[PDB]
Scaffold this active site. Structure first.
Site, PDB file in Angstrom:
ATOM      1  N   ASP A 181     -12.573 -53.722  51.569  1.00 48.23           N
ATOM      2  CA  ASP A 181     -13.747 -54.547  51.887  1.00 48.23           C
ATOM      3  C   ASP A 181     -14.762 -53.793  52.757  1.00 48.23           C
ATOM      4  OD1 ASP A 181     -12.957 -56.862  50.441  1.00 48.23           O
ATOM      5  OD2 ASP A 181     -12.929 -58.154  52.204  1.00 48.23           O
ATOM      6  N   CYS A 215     -20.726 -52.192  40.311  1.00 49.77           N
ATOM      7  CA  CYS A 215     -20.057 -52.763  41.468  1.00 49.77           C
ATOM      8  C   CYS A 215     -20.852 -53.999  41.827  1.00 49.77           C
ATOM      9  CB  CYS A 215     -19.954 -51.726  42.574  1.00 49.77           C
ATOM     10  SG  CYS A 215     -21.532 -50.760  42.895  1.00 49.77           S
ATOM     11  N   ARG A 221     -20.455 -47.602  45.201  1.00 52.81           N
ATOM     12  CA  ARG A 221     -19.239 -47.209  44.472  1.00 52.81           C
ATOM     13  C   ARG A 221     -19.561 -46.676  43.072  1.00 52.81           C
ATOM     14  NH1 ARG A 221     -15.885 -52.744  46.037  1.00 52.81           N
ATOM     15  NH2 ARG A 221     -16.501 -52.693  48.262  1.00 52.81           N
ATOM     16  N   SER A 222     -20.498 -47.324  42.373  1.00 52.20           N
ATOM     17  CA  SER A 222     -20.863 -46.875  41.028  1.00 52.20           C
ATOM     18  C   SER A 222     -21.391 -45.444  41.049  1.00 52.20           C
ATOM     19  CB  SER A 222     -21.920 -47.808  40.431  1.00 52.20           C
ATOM     20  OG  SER A 222     -21.416 -49.103  40.134  1.00 52.20           O
ATOM     21  N   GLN A 262     -24.548 -45.051  49.079  1.00 51.04           N
ATOM     22  CA  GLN A 262     -25.206 -45.972  50.020  1.00 51.04           C
ATOM     23  C   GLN A 262     -24.982 -45.636  51.490  1.00 51.04           C
ATOM     24  OE1 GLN A 262     -23.517 -49.688  48.144  1.00 51.04           O
ATOM     25  NE2 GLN A 262     -25.533 -50.519  48.655  1.00 51.04           N
TER      26      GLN A 262
END
Ligand SMILES: CNC(=S)NC1CCCCC1
Length: 284
Positions: A181, A215, A221-222, A262
């Site tokens: 998370d 994502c 994440r992508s 990110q």
């Protein structure tokens, strides 16, 4: 510089935030006018994450052709990817329309439906064989065929039917279920194992349309997934693998979609994954 020793040099000097901010400063800025039209407000999950006009995927529809999705085309590596946001309640039909029209074999999902107590994307595939889904706005039917649940990820076989032509296709759903998370994984081993399973399926290969990867926003994440894949492929293709520059590859990818990677922690994790992955390829 090489990668593994550039890596230790940034760790010892604690400068990951400064490296990452340089990338943000140098990244391309292109218009995203279609994304910002008022009629498309409920087609965007986040107001600050939009596809560029020049690289956006168009739906084959004359009313409204917009979806928050971008084509990342990597010329030297000879790989293409579609990066998109997690589908919204009012875009699940558009999502599968895109999968159909672009002839994709595989869908790569890097988030859970709920994280941090909030919904990160719609429940867009069926959970039981006998309870199929019909998307009436785009005239598609989706059926769960089989499901294989492993410790870090789940693979599903799905049948997508174009109800207008009665054509059917098999779609593979690769779901990485254990990204934390907060933060990034401590070891890249399970992410790399997952990447290799996607590869082994044929979903990334030229005989199919581009893989669809998402994502929640389709940039973090992508971005880590496609950056690691492309860097490892270039290390296999070139005479001198130490010439692969992960920062340059990332800036090339950011010509096609804004914001990829990110955080500075995601940047460091991408380095770690490529470094460890290059040892397993060989020769080992
Ligand atoms: C070492 N330099 C590299 S890998 N340059 C770029 C990386 C992205 C695409 C083209 C090659």
């Amino acid at each position: 510089m090489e990668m593994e020793k550039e890596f230790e040099q940034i760790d010892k000097s604690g400068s990951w935030a400064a490296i990452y901010q340089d990338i943000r400063h140098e990244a391309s800025d292109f218009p995203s006018r279609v994304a910002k039209l008022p009629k498309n407000k409920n087609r965007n999950r986040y107001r600050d994450v939009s596809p560029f006009d020049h690289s956006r995927i168009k739906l084959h529809q004359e009313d409204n052709d917009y979806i928050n999705a971008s084509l990342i085309k990597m010329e030297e590596a000879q790989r293409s990817y579609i990066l998109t946001q997690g589908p919204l309640p009012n875009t699940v039909g558009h999502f599968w329309e895109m999968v159909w029209e672009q002839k994709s074999r595989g869908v790569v999902m890097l988030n859970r439906v709920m994280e941090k107590g909030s919904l990160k994307c719609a429940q867009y595939w069926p959970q039981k064989e006998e309870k199929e889904m019909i998307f009436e706005d785009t005239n598609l039917k989706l059926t769960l065929i089989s499901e294989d649940i492993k410790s870090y990820y789940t693979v599903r076989q799905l049948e997508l039917e174009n109800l207008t032509t009665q054509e059917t296709r098999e779609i593979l759903h690769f779901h990485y279920t254990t990204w934390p998370d907060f933060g990034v994984p401590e070891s890249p081993a399970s992410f790399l194992n997952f990447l290799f399973k996607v590869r082994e399926s044929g979903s990334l290969s030229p005989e199919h349309g581009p893989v669809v990867v998402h994502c929640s926003a389709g940039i973090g994440r992508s971005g880590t997934f496609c950056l690691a894949d492309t860097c490892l492929l270039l290390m296999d293709k070139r005479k001198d693998p130490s010439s692969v520059d992960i920062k340059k590859v990332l800036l090339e990818m950011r010509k096609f979609r804004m914001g990829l990677i990110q955080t500075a922690d995601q940047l460091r994790f991408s380095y770690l994954a490529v470094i460890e992955g290059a040892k397993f390829i060989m020769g080992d």
